[PDB]
């Protein structure tokens, strides 16, 4: 394993290591804000490493047009569970990272809020949420 | 203690707690499966102004690395 | 109710800060903030 995480020395300067690597994200995306809020210098380095499409970066990683790429965990985990060859490798398990959740955006003060949350907790409280993960997630090895 | 004396054979318990315990004592062994993926919350009274800013503070701590420092203090630590 | 829930419902407690198990039965009586923890259950063997 090469990269420890966001604290890795590679994220200090690509010139610090002999091979000048490259890593970007989706433009106008949510995670781009996290880079700017935490490390504005990282955004300056990511400025020259920008890409256009999610699978375009996936093609670049397979072809070798990109060294590393930063995106969400659940999305990148599924694309790696069905990939042939499995050349691309995930890093960690959400260990040095946000560890947040997925939610439903409601209008402020919606009266549905109490009813919606009761079902969602009950949905994970009876194993029904577990089966849906089996249907749409595939972890080999 | 009872399972340490080899009187018990299985015991349902939390994940991180038993991870830290196996870190402290090498004889403590866990299983492989990971089920009931939920979270721990802050027990509160009924609706009160001590709810909004509390959850906002929890989110602001999760977004940055303070939870990482807490892990380094107690959870990440090993033997 | 008893324990932490009993002491909180009685008014003697204002806020329970403990590794609480988020579940529907207890959420029906009190409120929660967003979870700070992510984990489940396991089996302890020797």
């Amino acid at each position: 394993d090469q990269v420890t995480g966001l604290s890795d020395k590679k994220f200090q300067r690509p010139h610090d290591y002999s091979p000048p690597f490259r890593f970007g994200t989706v433009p106008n995306g949510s995670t781009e804000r996290n880079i700017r809020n935490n490390y504005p210098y990282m955004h300056q380095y990511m400025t020259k490493f920008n890409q256009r499409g999610v699978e375009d970066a996936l093609v670049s990683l397979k072809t070798g047009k990109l060294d590393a790429f930063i995106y969400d965990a659940a999305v990148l985990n599924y694309k790696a569970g069905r990939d042939e060859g499995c050349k691309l490798v995930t890093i960690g398990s959400g260990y040095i990272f946000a560890t947040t959740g997925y939610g439903i955006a409601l209008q402020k003060g919606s009266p549905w809020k109490r009813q919606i949350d009761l079902a969602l907790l009950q949905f994970v409280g009876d194993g029904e949420m577990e089966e849906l993960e089996t249907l749409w997630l595939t972890g080999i090895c | 203690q009872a399972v340490r004396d080899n009187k018990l054979h299985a015991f349902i318990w939390d994940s991180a707690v038993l991870e830290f315990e196996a870190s402290q004592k090498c004889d403590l062994v866990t299983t492989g499966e990971l089920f009931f993926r939920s979270g721990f919350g802050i027990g509160m009274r009924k609706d009160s102004p001590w709810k909004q800013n509390v959850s906002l503070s929890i989110l602001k701590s999760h977004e940055n690395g303070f939870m990482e420092d807490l892990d380094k203090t107690w959870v990440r630590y090993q033997e | 109710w008893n324990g932490m829930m009993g002491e909180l419902l009685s008014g003697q407690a204002d806020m329970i800060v403990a590794p609480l198990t988020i579940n529907n039965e207890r959420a029906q009586y009190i409120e929660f903030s967003k979870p700070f923890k992510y984990q489940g259950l396991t089996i302890l063997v020797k």
């Binding site: 969400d72 659940a74 050349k87 890093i91 947040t100 959740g101 209008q107 949905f123 | - | -």
Partner: peptide
């Protein structure tokens, strides 16, 4: 889920444990 999006709307409870990560070959 971040700050600036929590200012304009309200979220329900989350259901899946997802962070961010870096993909390498």
């Amino acid at each position: 889920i971040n700050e600036e999006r929590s200012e304009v709307v309200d979220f329900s409870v989350p259901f899946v444990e997802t962070g961010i990560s870096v993909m390498v070959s």
